[PDB]
């Protein structure tokens, strides 16, 4: 049973704890906040969880790993501190503000014999294994992925922008299925501070391209499509995927065996515990490399859109 | 309102569909077909009766019909349309009407000089659905849109010109002329696009355009507003349009697709000739211009070059 420490008192931290408990693989033991009262209010619904308002004391505790869901600007210092204290880390997305920070965390992680994971919940869905297996003997000609849902220091603003907050999902989906792209572009409708409300991008692969749409002031219900020489694979979404149906050029359909998990974090929560308990190091390096690929794309896309 | 005598250039299935629609409207009668080989004209015309067949292009244009539908390869469109207008014939050019925007403006000058109409046969542009959608959106603040037209076919052209023209016409019909546009395509070695993705840039929003000929998309077309999303099943031969707000509520729009894809344009062209609304005509000319300007810009950004 993994003893779990938590940083960040948002609703997302409750949902992670709920999934961690439900997996039967974690035990919550510690919560940190700079204002002790905020931690106490957050932790009240749980039983005898120890509270900390000093990062250095928190990390001297006996827990095995920390889930970090604080604002983006604090991730790198907190995670680096966690890894230097011998704790495994799960960083909520986006894990870092920029690519170089990811590689530095990896260095600290290796140096301290610890794991660092980015909590990209869609990437660990079983559905992607099924889809990738199905595509293995097809010739892919393109794809179109989106995630846009209406909702009512600058770096933390940016991290809340469409590309960083929602666009990261179709980016992770593309990297999971297609690997690292050669190049990318992105253009956005922006606030006057340059933060993106929504936007459209393209990932460029050797023989095809992938359209990406992200939005937080608009809702898209568009399916996500992957084009092949013999037809089109249609996914209802690229996050918490529920169905995958292939239609050929005659109109004949085949349904892939997709079973979504009860909750959106179920699969990632199970993957992280299994990695820590029974290490598969090659697969871990794949996770690291893919996160790096996503961050590289985000950094490029931000620049092409003039988000600064 | 007398019956329009119609001549046709182009002996493909599209010309058959156009003629069928023209006859069905009750406002046209086919009288003449031109082809480079007179046998070809004869074979094409076998189902129709009392059709004059022509092998001589300028003689065809000086014959006694009222308007010509031109569905030859688009590299021939400009010269054929100019001659037709110079002979005092009204012209319908199958899409894309021209390969470059100045050709369209040059044809407009010839048409005005000869007191004749020039139409581009953009079948979706004339759908009643677009009037209904535009009226609906007049009460809304648009925040963006996503339009596509990608259909696999085995085998001036390419996905943008042949299929992308549909979502461009839809965008122009609803939103008017964009400030700017871009397009990036997957291309053959000759630079012609198999498929691609573009953006139309408007002052306060952008419109994603997808076109493709080696791939099939069944994505609906969406228009985003501050209060929700309007979803169209397609932007051509539109069947359904429904608005959904952010609280799960819907507004239905009254869409009734015509029996055929060309029904509404054929009716529009006859009505314009018989009972001209010249302000409306100028709108049609202007919008066609906007579409051809955007196509030309998009070809530049994508590096798509013909011949
Ligand atoms: K979706």
XYZ file of C-alpha atoms and ligand atoms in Angstrom:
616
model
C 0.000 0.000 0.000
C 1.527 3.267 -1.191
C 1.442 6.087 1.324
C 0.312 9.234 -0.446
C 1.034 12.894 0.181
C -0.968 15.618 -1.539
C -0.110 19.162 -2.611
C -2.906 21.340 -4.001
C -6.366 21.794 -2.482
C -8.472 22.067 -5.659
C -11.429 19.823 -6.494
C -9.099 17.845 -8.770
C -7.117 16.716 -5.721
C -10.333 15.272 -4.192
C -11.040 13.367 -7.433
C -7.462 11.956 -7.470
C -7.727 10.851 -3.818
C -11.104 9.213 -4.567
C -9.553 7.262 -7.463
C -6.413 6.406 -5.457
C -8.538 5.006 -2.609
C -10.884 3.125 -4.976
C -7.912 1.373 -6.662
C -7.108 -0.191 -3.290
C -3.431 0.579 -3.889
C -2.934 3.909 -2.034
C -3.399 5.273 1.471
C -3.643 9.063 1.894
C -1.544 10.209 4.901
C -0.439 13.836 4.431
C -1.677 17.142 3.020
C 0.324 20.325 2.553
C -0.864 23.943 2.158
C 0.839 27.297 2.960
C -2.187 28.282 5.075
C -2.791 25.507 7.615
C -6.526 26.335 7.649
C -6.849 25.670 3.888
C -5.360 22.194 4.427
C -7.674 21.548 7.390
C -10.781 22.585 5.419
C -9.669 20.442 2.470
C -8.858 17.436 4.693
C -11.911 17.585 6.987
C -13.882 14.956 5.015
C -11.064 12.422 5.553
C -9.929 10.558 8.684
C -6.859 11.637 10.679
C -4.838 12.953 7.746
C -1.748 14.782 8.975
C -1.376 18.408 7.953
C 1.770 20.318 7.066
C 2.444 23.966 6.260
C 6.220 23.555 5.850
C 7.443 21.956 2.620
C 10.648 20.780 4.302
C 8.755 19.033 7.150
C 6.181 17.583 4.704
C 8.960 15.943 2.667
C 10.639 14.511 5.829
C 7.437 12.463 6.460
C 7.348 8.740 5.737
C 4.998 8.766 2.695
C 6.151 7.085 -0.553
C 4.879 9.532 -3.179
C 3.323 12.941 -3.630
C 0.543 14.060 -6.005
C 1.129 17.674 -6.972
C -1.801 19.741 -8.260
C -0.731 23.255 -7.231
C -0.565 26.104 -9.774
C 1.903 25.468 -12.659
C 4.511 28.012 -11.495
C 5.055 26.004 -8.277
C 5.341 22.516 -9.849
C 9.026 22.621 -10.676
C 10.316 23.746 -7.262
C 7.915 21.468 -5.368
C 8.605 18.452 -7.563
C 12.383 19.041 -7.499
C 12.171 19.317 -3.698
C 10.076 16.129 -3.575
C 12.579 14.131 -5.680
C 15.546 15.447 -3.644
C 13.746 14.167 -0.552
C 13.454 10.699 -2.096
C 9.729 10.934 -2.950
C 8.114 9.670 -6.130
C 6.110 12.401 -7.868
C 2.895 12.614 -9.854
C 2.627 16.077 -11.429
C -0.825 17.161 -12.623
C -0.860 18.528 -16.197
C 0.753 20.651 -17.467
C 3.689 19.224 -15.478
C 6.115 22.087 -16.279
C 6.028 25.574 -17.838
C 8.708 24.640 -20.380
C 10.684 21.698 -21.770
C 14.011 22.298 -19.960
C 12.293 21.940 -16.562
C 11.124 18.405 -17.473
C 14.635 17.233 -18.296
C 15.978 18.761 -15.059
C 13.317 16.917 -13.036
C 14.278 13.702 -14.823
C 17.927 14.314 -13.826
C 16.927 14.853 -10.195
C 14.658 11.796 -10.363
C 17.395 9.473 -11.690
C 19.913 10.919 -9.241
C 17.592 10.076 -6.321
C 16.370 6.680 -7.607
C 12.768 8.001 -7.862
C 9.980 8.100 -10.481
C 8.478 11.255 -11.998
C 5.111 10.951 -13.801
C 2.966 13.536 -15.600
C -0.713 12.863 -14.843
C -1.946 12.732 -18.445
C -5.117 10.764 -17.765
C -6.073 9.995 -21.376
C -2.593 8.628 -22.278
C -3.032 5.672 -19.882
C -6.487 4.659 -21.132
C -6.640 1.014 -22.299
C -8.495 2.264 -25.383
C -5.258 3.700 -26.814
C -3.621 0.258 -26.750
C -6.613 -1.166 -28.623
C -6.628 1.680 -31.142
C -2.845 1.602 -31.679
C -2.981 -2.147 -32.206
C -5.816 -1.708 -34.749
C -3.856 0.979 -36.623
C -0.578 -1.020 -36.693
C -1.366 -2.651 -40.069
C -3.097 0.404 -41.624
C -1.543 3.262 -43.537
C -2.476 6.470 -41.719
C -3.262 9.472 -43.989
C -4.115 12.087 -41.350
C -6.203 12.777 -38.257
C -8.359 15.454 -36.646
C -8.491 15.688 -32.853
C -10.185 18.206 -30.601
C -11.002 19.080 -27.026
C -13.063 22.236 -26.483
C -15.430 22.719 -23.538
C -17.069 25.949 -22.421
C -16.280 27.157 -18.932
C -17.381 30.489 -17.453
C 1.764 34.729 -12.791
C 1.289 35.117 -16.583
C 2.728 31.600 -16.819
C -0.093 30.404 -14.489
C -2.595 32.327 -16.654
C -1.115 30.700 -19.812
C -1.321 27.237 -18.185
C -5.049 27.946 -17.867
C -5.191 28.889 -21.595
C -6.952 26.622 -24.100
C -3.784 25.027 -25.512
C -2.183 24.217 -22.129
C -5.330 23.279 -20.220
C -7.370 21.455 -22.919
C -5.133 21.172 -26.025
C -2.726 18.995 -24.061
C -5.283 16.144 -24.313
C -5.376 15.864 -28.139
C -1.581 16.408 -28.133
C -1.112 13.461 -25.765
C -3.514 11.433 -27.925
C -1.454 12.204 -31.083
C 1.876 11.397 -29.389
C 0.448 8.170 -27.892
C -0.711 6.915 -31.329
C 1.754 8.534 -33.755
C 4.830 9.420 -31.721
C 6.726 12.668 -31.896
C 5.800 15.042 -34.732
C 8.429 16.730 -36.946
C 6.968 20.183 -36.363
C 3.796 22.008 -35.376
C 1.837 25.212 -35.765
C -0.983 26.864 -33.830
C -3.058 30.024 -34.247
C -5.436 31.277 -31.584
C -8.076 33.821 -30.724
C -6.563 35.621 -27.801
C -7.369 37.985 -24.984
C -5.476 41.294 -25.058
C -2.833 39.731 -22.748
C -2.274 37.095 -25.502
C -3.814 34.154 -23.575
C -5.727 31.850 -25.935
C -9.498 31.375 -25.693
C -9.435 28.817 -28.488
C -7.320 27.881 -31.449
C -6.475 25.555 -34.291
C -3.161 23.849 -34.938
C -1.501 21.177 -37.030
C 1.055 18.531 -36.127
C 3.278 17.696 -39.097
C 4.331 14.082 -39.579
C 6.459 12.738 -42.486
C 3.516 11.593 -44.641
C 0.464 13.227 -43.018
C -0.771 15.933 -40.676
C -3.010 16.026 -37.626
C -5.411 18.912 -37.005
C -5.721 19.967 -33.347
C -8.521 22.164 -31.960
C -8.641 23.475 -28.391
C -11.134 25.789 -26.694
C -12.372 27.019 -23.329
C -14.958 29.632 -24.449
C -16.598 27.226 -26.926
C -17.896 23.651 -26.835
C -17.151 21.218 -29.652
C -18.903 17.864 -29.846
C -16.934 16.866 -32.964
C -15.703 13.278 -33.028
C -12.038 12.656 -33.517
C -11.113 10.970 -36.786
C -8.053 9.062 -37.969
C -7.877 8.608 -41.748
C -6.363 5.536 -43.358
C -6.036 4.383 -46.959
C -8.971 1.944 -46.436
C -11.349 4.187 -44.408
C -11.814 6.327 -41.306
C -11.560 5.427 -37.627
C -13.986 7.553 -35.579
C -13.441 8.079 -31.841
C -16.185 9.799 -29.886
C -13.444 11.719 -28.003
C -9.700 11.434 -27.297
C -10.258 11.584 -23.526
C -12.318 9.100 -21.507
C -12.862 7.380 -24.845
C -16.148 5.478 -25.078
C -16.277 4.184 -28.656
C -14.087 3.590 -31.707
C -15.753 2.685 -35.036
C -14.031 2.084 -38.357
C -15.941 2.805 -41.591
C -14.507 1.565 -44.903
C -14.896 3.066 -48.383
C -17.956 0.912 -49.039
C -19.572 2.186 -45.782
C -19.087 -1.065 -43.847
C -18.389 -0.608 -40.141
C -16.390 -2.480 -37.552
C -16.477 -1.619 -33.853
C -13.362 -1.798 -31.696
C -13.771 -3.317 -28.217
C -13.627 -0.156 -26.073
C -14.696 -0.137 -22.399
C -14.295 3.190 -20.653
C -13.353 3.119 -16.995
C -15.837 4.281 -14.355
C -13.879 7.495 -13.795
C -11.488 9.570 -15.874
C -8.442 9.037 -13.590
C -8.952 5.327 -12.918
C -6.478 4.047 -15.466
C -3.621 6.486 -14.773
C -3.939 5.917 -10.995
C -3.586 2.159 -11.545
C -0.659 2.574 -13.962
C 1.375 4.713 -11.559
C 0.957 2.278 -8.651
C 1.840 -0.736 -10.844
C 4.970 1.050 -12.150
C 6.146 1.766 -8.590
C 5.351 -1.753 -7.301
C 6.604 -3.749 -10.298
C 8.967 -1.490 -12.340
C 9.044 -1.776 -16.131
C 11.860 0.661 -16.856
C 11.651 0.621 -20.657
C 7.977 1.567 -20.474
C 8.859 4.286 -17.925
C 11.370 5.780 -20.359
C 8.637 5.755 -22.993
C 6.387 7.750 -20.633
C 9.216 10.255 -20.034
C 10.016 10.615 -23.725
C 6.372 11.083 -24.704
C 5.852 13.769 -22.032
C 8.925 15.491 -23.466
C 7.423 15.295 -26.946
C 4.129 16.852 -25.752
C 5.995 19.695 -23.995
C 8.124 20.366 -27.055
C 4.950 20.706 -29.155
C 3.240 22.965 -26.603
C 6.295 25.285 -26.521
C 6.432 25.504 -30.319
C 2.672 26.044 -30.598
C 2.715 28.762 -28.000
C 5.395 30.611 -29.967
C 3.701 30.281 -33.365
C 0.501 31.667 -31.822
C 2.393 34.585 -30.163
C 1.241 33.670 -26.663
C 3.683 35.709 -24.497
C -41.580 34.573 -67.744
C -40.556 32.595 -70.847
C -38.699 29.272 -71.001
C -34.930 29.614 -71.150
C -33.240 27.946 -74.097
C -30.120 26.209 -72.754
C -26.846 25.178 -74.402
C -24.305 22.918 -72.678
C -20.530 22.486 -72.792
C -19.202 19.412 -70.992
C -20.403 15.861 -71.547
C -19.910 14.318 -68.084
C -22.433 13.043 -65.534
C -22.526 16.492 -63.895
C -23.957 18.005 -67.102
C -26.669 15.320 -67.079
C -27.521 16.182 -63.464
C -27.601 19.892 -64.309
C -29.899 19.317 -67.299
C -32.212 17.125 -65.234
C -32.479 19.866 -62.602
C -33.026 22.548 -65.259
C -35.829 20.568 -66.901
C -37.335 19.695 -63.511
C -37.521 23.381 -62.601
C -39.847 23.903 -65.591
C -37.901 27.038 -66.537
C -35.357 25.700 -69.055
C -35.207 23.586 -72.210
C -31.991 22.109 -73.566
C -31.527 22.948 -77.259
C -27.801 22.594 -77.977
C -24.683 20.658 -76.980
C -21.110 21.428 -77.971
C -18.194 18.987 -78.033
C -14.767 18.894 -79.712
C -15.760 15.531 -81.215
C -19.283 15.594 -82.694
C -19.660 11.871 -81.945
C -19.123 12.618 -78.239
C -21.922 15.226 -78.427
C -24.115 12.659 -80.167
C -23.454 9.947 -77.534
C -24.129 12.364 -74.650
C -27.318 13.647 -76.353
C -28.831 10.174 -77.113
C -31.456 10.404 -74.340
C -32.560 13.925 -75.326
C -34.494 14.791 -78.474
C -34.264 17.608 -81.034
C -30.913 18.805 -79.761
C -28.643 20.772 -82.086
C -25.131 19.328 -82.006
C -22.061 21.491 -82.439
C -18.409 20.903 -83.183
C -17.600 24.587 -83.856
C -17.327 26.546 -80.639
C -17.869 30.091 -81.901
C -20.828 28.922 -84.027
C -22.344 27.281 -80.928
C -22.023 30.581 -79.016
C -23.666 32.576 -81.837
C -26.653 30.170 -82.020
C -30.141 31.129 -80.813
C -30.114 29.858 -77.202
C -30.317 32.140 -74.136
C -27.716 30.782 -71.736
C -24.872 28.298 -71.620
C -23.875 25.946 -68.807
C -20.125 25.398 -68.972
C -18.685 22.280 -67.364
C -15.457 21.885 -69.367
C -12.112 21.602 -67.524
C -11.539 24.857 -65.647
C -8.447 25.734 -67.714
C -10.901 26.389 -70.587
C -13.513 28.301 -68.549
C -12.256 31.838 -68.968
C -11.890 31.753 -72.766
C -15.204 29.962 -73.241
C -17.114 32.238 -70.861
C -15.641 35.389 -72.422
C -16.693 34.283 -75.932
C -20.170 33.297 -74.718
C -20.691 36.678 -73.039
C -19.269 38.449 -76.106
C -21.903 36.594 -78.150
C -24.628 37.899 -75.817
C -25.189 34.639 -73.928
C -25.738 34.383 -70.191
C -23.228 32.046 -68.569
C -23.244 29.533 -65.736
C -19.752 28.260 -64.915
C -19.461 25.042 -62.945
C -17.258 25.403 -59.847
C -14.487 26.418 -59.591
C -15.513 29.087 -62.115
C -11.962 30.363 -62.665
C -8.439 29.351 -61.606
C -7.439 32.834 -60.440
C -9.444 35.739 -59.110
C -8.661 38.386 -61.765
C -10.282 36.125 -64.404
C -13.570 36.499 -62.495
C -13.340 40.297 -62.427
C -12.363 40.334 -66.099
C -15.411 38.173 -66.972
C -17.659 40.550 -64.986
C -16.451 43.445 -67.166
C -17.265 41.477 -70.336
C -20.706 40.495 -69.015
C -21.629 44.087 -68.105
C -20.443 45.393 -71.477
C -22.643 42.817 -73.237
C -25.556 43.275 -70.774
C -25.385 39.588 -69.747
C -25.304 37.643 -66.459
C -22.386 35.495 -65.291
C -23.064 32.931 -62.525
C -20.815 30.495 -60.670
C -22.644 27.200 -60.019
C -21.897 26.989 -56.297
C -24.778 24.710 -55.394
C -24.532 25.086 -51.589
C -24.459 28.918 -51.647
C -28.034 29.031 -53.005
C -29.525 26.606 -50.449
C -32.467 28.068 -48.476
C -30.797 26.539 -45.399
C -28.200 29.360 -45.483
C -30.852 32.061 -45.303
C -32.356 30.323 -42.258
C -28.949 29.882 -40.589
C -27.873 33.468 -41.319
C -31.160 34.809 -39.894
C -30.674 32.648 -36.798
C -27.116 33.899 -36.278
C -28.160 37.584 -36.572
C -29.150 37.385 -32.851
C -25.813 35.778 -31.826
C -22.214 36.683 -31.322
C -20.124 34.178 -33.300
C -16.850 32.988 -31.668
C -15.577 30.667 -34.415
C -16.541 27.837 -36.738
C -15.325 24.519 -38.100
C -16.393 23.493 -41.639
C -15.180 20.542 -43.743
C -15.706 18.709 -46.979
C -13.607 15.585 -47.517
C -14.780 12.660 -49.619
C -12.600 9.778 -50.839
C -12.478 9.268 -54.605
C -10.265 6.588 -56.143
C -9.215 8.196 -59.454
C -6.300 23.471 -61.920
C -7.543 21.072 -59.232
C -6.808 19.355 -55.929
C -8.749 19.065 -52.697
C -8.916 22.797 -51.968
C -10.199 23.780 -55.421
C -12.470 20.791 -56.032
C -13.894 20.246 -52.505
C -12.568 23.040 -50.219
C -14.573 25.467 -52.349
C -17.757 24.215 -50.620
C -16.819 25.155 -47.002
C -15.274 28.420 -48.307
C -18.561 29.317 -49.989
C -20.384 28.456 -46.749
C -18.087 30.732 -44.729
C -18.449 33.607 -47.176
C -22.222 33.111 -47.377
C -22.557 33.373 -43.590
C -19.652 35.550 -42.461
C -18.613 37.507 -45.553
C -15.050 38.068 -46.711
C -12.304 37.038 -44.270
C -9.390 39.394 -43.418
C -6.835 36.757 -44.289
C -6.462 33.012 -44.765
C -3.892 30.250 -44.546
C -3.762 26.641 -45.699
C -1.319 23.740 -45.323
C -1.693 20.620 -47.379
C -0.435 17.132 -47.860
C 0.783 17.268 -51.447
C 1.831 15.111 -54.372
C 5.228 15.748 -55.947
C 3.565 18.115 -58.470
C 2.355 20.258 -55.476
C -1.352 19.337 -55.895
C -3.122 18.782 -52.556
C -4.635 15.448 -51.504
C -6.001 17.039 -48.317
C -5.353 19.987 -46.073
C -6.337 22.251 -43.237
C -6.832 25.983 -43.387
C -8.022 28.896 -41.289
C -10.059 31.918 -42.306
C -9.253 34.918 -40.095
C -12.057 37.298 -39.178
C -11.760 40.333 -36.870
C -13.003 38.564 -33.713
C -12.865 34.841 -34.594
C -11.463 32.233 -36.984
C -12.956 29.463 -39.113
C -11.203 26.107 -39.595
C -11.525 24.653 -43.110
C -10.734 21.014 -43.955
C -10.716 19.611 -47.476
C -9.724 16.183 -48.758
C -9.971 13.811 -51.729
C -7.936 10.853 -50.471
C -9.842 10.709 -47.130
C -13.464 10.795 -45.951
C -14.680 12.974 -43.088
C -18.153 12.685 -41.566
C -17.589 15.465 -39.023
C -20.511 17.842 -38.564
C -19.884 21.510 -39.166
C -20.082 23.720 -36.076
C -20.567 27.438 -35.529
C -19.714 28.597 -31.995
C -21.570 31.455 -30.318
C -21.211 32.994 -26.867
C -24.256 31.001 -25.710
C -23.703 27.643 -27.444
C -23.025 25.713 -30.617
C -24.965 25.481 -33.858
C -24.420 22.102 -35.483
C -24.992 21.509 -39.191
C -24.824 17.970 -40.526
C -22.851 19.311 -43.544
C -22.289 22.658 -45.351
C -23.614 21.219 -48.634
C -27.024 19.696 -49.293
C -27.701 20.619 -45.671
C -30.233 18.320 -43.964
C -30.267 19.491 -40.331
C -29.267 22.392 -38.128
C -29.665 22.421 -34.360
C -28.416 24.800 -31.685
C -27.402 23.546 -28.239
C -26.748 25.934 -25.377
C -24.434 25.467 -22.393
C -27.258 24.118 -20.153
C -28.355 21.190 -22.395
C -31.243 23.023 -24.111
C -31.818 23.064 -27.868
C -33.272 25.282 -30.571
C -34.338 23.563 -33.791
C -33.897 25.340 -37.118
C -36.359 24.678 -39.963
C -34.231 23.038 -42.646
C -35.751 21.195 -45.594
C -33.166 19.859 -48.061
C -34.193 20.060 -51.695
C -34.802 16.800 -53.563
C -31.492 17.267 -55.406
C -28.225 19.080 -54.815
C -28.659 21.497 -57.757
C -32.370 22.232 -57.368
C -31.959 25.522 -55.535
C -29.201 27.090 -57.703
C -30.992 26.223 -60.970
C -34.146 27.918 -59.656
C -32.105 30.967 -58.546
C -30.440 31.430 -61.943
C -33.768 31.254 -63.865
C -35.456 33.644 -61.430
C -32.564 36.127 -61.777
C -32.722 36.111 -65.554
C -36.543 36.317 -65.746
C -37.091 38.780 -62.881
C -33.736 40.445 -62.133
C -32.812 41.637 -58.652
C -29.624 43.489 -59.546
C -28.580 44.257 -55.958
C -28.743 40.499 -55.251
C -26.745 39.762 -58.412
C -24.001 42.126 -57.256
C -23.894 40.233 -53.931
C -23.450 36.940 -55.805
C -20.621 38.401 -57.907
C -18.939 39.927 -54.838
C -19.138 36.715 -52.797
C -17.767 34.616 -55.691
C -14.914 37.127 -55.839
C -14.254 36.738 -52.113
C -14.143 32.928 -52.435
C -11.708 33.053 -55.353
C -9.496 35.549 -53.515
C -9.371 33.251 -50.468
C -8.655 30.180 -52.620
C -5.783 32.048 -54.300
C -4.279 33.160 -50.982
C -4.603 29.625 -49.627
C -2.839 28.162 -52.649
C 0.001 30.608 -52.059
C 0.413 29.663 -48.383
C 0.328 25.931 -49.230
C 2.643 26.120 -52.252
C 0.020 24.660 -54.620
C 0.901 25.472 -58.260
C -0.868 24.237 -61.416
C 0.464 22.667 -64.664
K -15.790 14.934 -28.946
